[PDB]
Every structure is written in structure tokens, then in C-alpha cells.
Design a protein around this nucleic acid. Sequence first.
DNA 1: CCTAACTGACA
DNA 2: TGTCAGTTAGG
Length: 105
Amino acid sequence: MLIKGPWTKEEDQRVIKLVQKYGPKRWSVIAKHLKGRIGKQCRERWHNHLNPEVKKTSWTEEEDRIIYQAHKRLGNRWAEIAKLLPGRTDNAIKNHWNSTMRRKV
DNA sequence: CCTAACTGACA
DNA sequence: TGTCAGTTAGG
């Protein structure tokens, strides 16, 4: 039967409302309503740039300058960079770098 | 280039 | 259980 695979439909529609109600710090409970997409699955879709709580402004200049600096000293510490960078959680700035800025300017 | 999607290791 | 560091997948 259908299980795992891409994350959408009865996936976002759940975490999307459950996060705005509880918050991204109860993945253990959030998971219970996602049927099989438990524990980590919910976190995977989220904590990146999905959070409707942060409009998809994306990288351009005022943010593209972050990786160029933040990574230059704390790149391998995406967790703290992300914390000091509201919006792009510990995943957006991580994959962005290793795809877009994969040249360590 | 851009976000999404997951795994292994760690706190 | 959640986070932390890196890699993978589709558009």
C-alpha cells in the first residue's frame, strides 16, 4: 500500500495546522495524527522554509550575504546560524549552501 | 538555483 | 525524543 514517498496531501495539511496550534516542539504528539508519518517524518517536511509562519522570501542579497559570512566561520554549525537567522531553519541554509553556494566564496 | 526529503550521528 | 551535521531527490 501507499507509505512514505513524497510528502504532501494529508501530510502538510496536518503539520500546517498542528504547528500553528502547538508549535514545532512536540513532534512526538504531532506524529500521532499523521498516521504512519511519525517521529522524524513530520520534522523532515518542516524545519526548512515550509513554515507558513515565515513567508517564502528566499535568498537574494540581504539573505545571500548571510551564507557568505555565517558559513565563513560557523558553516559547519548550521544549528546556531539557523537560530541567529529567523525563518531559514537548520535545513534551508544547509541545503541551500550545498547546491547554490557550493563553491565557498 | 530552490525547496523539499531522508539518513546517520549526536545532545 | 529532538536536534545536529551531512547527503540525497525532484522541480
